[PDB]
Amino acid sequence: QPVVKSLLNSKGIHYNQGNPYNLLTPVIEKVKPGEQSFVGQHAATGCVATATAQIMKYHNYPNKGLKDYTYTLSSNNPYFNHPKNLFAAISTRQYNWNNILPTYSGRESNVQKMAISELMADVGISVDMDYGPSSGSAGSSRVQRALKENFGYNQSVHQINRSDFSKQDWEAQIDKELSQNQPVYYQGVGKVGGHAFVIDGADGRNFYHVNWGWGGVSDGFFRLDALNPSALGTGGGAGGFNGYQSAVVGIKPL
């Protein structure tokens, strides 16, 4: 395994799902019965959107969006009144990558905060985000389509599933991406839920550098069969994103 220093850390890229990344996501409308109110707050951007946006910032691409996207929220979502349609006019977007900064401490201009919030909202819409206090998506299969069809990434973009490869061939694909300066979108599921994140480096000893999309919390080196950040889990036990794994590779501009 070659040694590759964290590609996103090298560029200062550290996004999250809350403010100021979520300033353009839908505003929660209803209290879910039995829960405390989140009414009037923006929904989380969704880990799938945060992982994808960090990769797009690594490339500063595209300058122009390619195709609009529309979808309808599941009628089972208790945070919104139904029906609820969401639309992102991506075909009209001119993203200014000088204003979509690599990270945000709070002192940035409103223009800079709105620039990253517009990217996060467009990416989230393009992956059919189920918005809420937490926000979920199907992930990889939607990410690969959105990157190519809505954002104009190369036809090299595609989903790979862990179950279709040996461990060696799986890791060799991850390593080839990293050798080409191409951070990898990655997800999995397990006993602390499902999550999406970015693989962006390697230490030569079969651990990979992971950016979890929580602003830096838990980022570090992990084996791909023990993607187990200590920031999750209540009660003291173990858990990680080790099942039903998939990735989106070949992520580079047209």
Partner: peptide
């Protein structure tokens, strides 16, 4: 839509 369970990847969060």
């Amino acid at each position: 839509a369970e990847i969060x």
